[PDB]
Amino acid sequence: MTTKRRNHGRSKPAHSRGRVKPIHCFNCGRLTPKDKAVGRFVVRRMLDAASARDVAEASPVYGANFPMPKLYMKQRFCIACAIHSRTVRARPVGNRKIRYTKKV
Amino acid sequence: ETMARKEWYDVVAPANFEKRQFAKTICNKTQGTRIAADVLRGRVFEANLADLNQSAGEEEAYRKVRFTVQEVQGRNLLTQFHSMEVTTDKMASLLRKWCTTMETTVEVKTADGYTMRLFVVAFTKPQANQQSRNCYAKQRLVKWLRMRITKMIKRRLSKVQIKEAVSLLTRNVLSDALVRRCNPILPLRELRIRKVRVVRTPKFDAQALLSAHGTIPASVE
Amino acid sequence: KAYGPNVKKGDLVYGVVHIFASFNDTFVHVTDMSGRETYVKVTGGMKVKADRDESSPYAAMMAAQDVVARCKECGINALHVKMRAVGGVRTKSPGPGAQAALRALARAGMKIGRIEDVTPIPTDSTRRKGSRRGRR
Amino acid sequence: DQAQVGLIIKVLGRTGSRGNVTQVRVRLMAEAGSPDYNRTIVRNVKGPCKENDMLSLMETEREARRLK
RNA sequence: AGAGGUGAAAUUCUUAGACCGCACCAAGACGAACUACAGCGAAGGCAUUCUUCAAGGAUACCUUCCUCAAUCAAGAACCAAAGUGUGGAGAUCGAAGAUGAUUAGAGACCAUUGUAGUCCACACUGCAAACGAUGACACCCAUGAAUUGGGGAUCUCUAUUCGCACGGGAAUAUCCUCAGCACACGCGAAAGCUUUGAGGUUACAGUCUCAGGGGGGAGUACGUUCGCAAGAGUGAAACUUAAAGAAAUUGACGGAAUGGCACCACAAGACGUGGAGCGUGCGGUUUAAUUUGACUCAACACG
Lengths: 104, 221, 136, 68
Description:
The structure is cut from a larger assembly and holds chains A, B, C and D.
Chain B: H1 2-5, E1 6-11, E2 23-28, H2 36-40, E3 44-48, H3 49-52, E4 63-71, E5 76-86, H4 88-92, E6 101-109, E7 115-124, H5 139-158, H6 162-170, H7 173-182, E8 188-195, E9 198-200, H8 206-213
Parallel strand pairs in B: 1-5
Antiparallel strand pairs in B: 1-2, 3-4, 4-5, 6-7, 7-8, 7-9
Chain C: E1 14-21, E2 26-31, E3 38-43, H1 57-74, E4 78-84, H2 100-106, E5 111-117
Parallel strand pairs in C: 1-4, 4-5
Antiparallel strand pairs in C: 1-2, 2-3
Chain D: E1 7-14, E2 22-27, E3 40-45
Antiparallel strand pairs in D: 1-2, 2-3
The structure holds one RNA strand.
């Protein structure tokens, strides 16, 4: 019926590609096209802050001017698996169009 | 229990490294027809370069070096270079969206007989003035990196012996030169050597190993 | 009684710990440089009586202590660490019983150094278990 | 003995569905010439709590709410 | 000495050593991150590197040619996934199948499996939400920041960083320009469209072509052409029906979210109401009559 988006939920305009190999969903397995799926890049700490003080204490080399490693992963979510996880939520019609991009 | 029949050993490193004997391990008693040594050969042993050298407070805690046991002398374990790595988390933090990453592989056969793969990774840079939202490289400049990065690693490591070759890799002399020459093509952010693993070992020759370790340190045990 | 290397007392013998923690369980596993040999293999389910809490973080804490019970016996003071997600195609996010292992180690008196992420990463993967629709 | 008597530094908030338990940051009560703080381990308390409560912890060194 | 897997389990694997940890070896698939409102392709589709073979667009040009063109019944080629044929391959996943759970029932959804298949060569099929649900060629059309090719100027804008060797180079900055994918008028039932039109249309005319004529029946029936088959193209009527449908609005509802608030709500939890003793009220059965209202909260010690 009504078009809900000028974009149809894709990064793909008409007269661009046409296919866009699909990817698996973190948490689900749903195949969705790499445009559709909601990506997030993460940079996560290995250890909770109060767990760092313990381990960062217990190490000869680590924890002074040198820090711990982190977990770096992209996450590509099915649009269902993304809403349920709340990484994205519905938004009022006026606000549907907002692009955060990366700025600072 | 099991720690009873076990024995201890320390793992020597080639003399070009600083800390020589970096590890403590185990093997069963000779135990009849079985022989402790024959099982101890081929065991890879790992390290972190900042642990192994006394160098690098500054940039290398991030390279893992690993060795294989090619001989067993006394209570020691004598090794040879097996591979060099870049740690999982160091390599995952180099990536950036909006830049191009440019990877190569180079196979060199050293003067010493070993043929080693070399995995290089170069990242494009935004310029000072750069008003644009992209670092992306034209693909004819990408392909004219890979030819240099090959021609240099072929030319420099092929006329060298592993003893001098490993020191080029662990002291990042290559990486310094591979940037110097490959910088004028594309502005490069970092160009690193991700993995070195040594594919073919020429032979086993005792003298070649012994003169690789120099003066071997004591291992009570 | 303890079986050590011959080492001037108080100096520390490094050994490696492979912490592989899925969402269904946790392994706390001590090996040596290579890893051709083990000292302690304890799973978060060896200390727990049910499959529900098999993976719980208070399970790993009780497992990682019994690794220090054994290491002090095997003469291993300090540990390098390798931490692992359930695997390459399935899930890259570490399980809840990770971090409850390390603390139960540092807080048990072990040294620590040079943690890494060993979780195997598919440059290119075979198909994941879920159907094209997903797990639903 | 098992009594390790800490202070509530603060009520780190209400936590949980019914209104009952409350997240709290605990300052281990015991003081020694080598003062052993945690310094702080978050806890969940059962029943009403207040700014200077003495909270003796029978199960020490558990990392609290984290997960849920 | 457990492992797996789940909401919790169990089917399944384990002292004949699984799970786990190192280094390898074998096979088949696959090309992560970089990866974008990016590029290329007529569409379908296309992601490692190196070599290699024919092409394709864009741009540059005071080359050549001189109407050779636009769109198209019939006709031809290509067409994702599944399918089909003969050989190969057989790692992962997995229609059918088997097993354990779930359930009032439940081969379903979930879990351990598993055949065809998924992959490749050579043939067929031509049946997509094959979508931008938007035919093709041409013209006119305002604005802001961007982006991918190529070119030009700076050598009023001229400037930055890198330094025989695939290099009198590479990228950037300012400005222009052609060509590509995109983020004011007017029109529209509205949603919305806009130099990437759904604009320039009752003030109706630039050209060609395809399809539609209330909803069903029905893409069915018969006929016929094509196909190994599955099926594809072409395609009615009898009969039935007063609406079906589109956009938008205000309510209502949600096992959607988001702030809140309630002891007729819960917590923590005090006192007994539930089923005998007995006060009536109601229902019932009874009898001439058991007069009668009011049946969730807002009916029943109430009239």
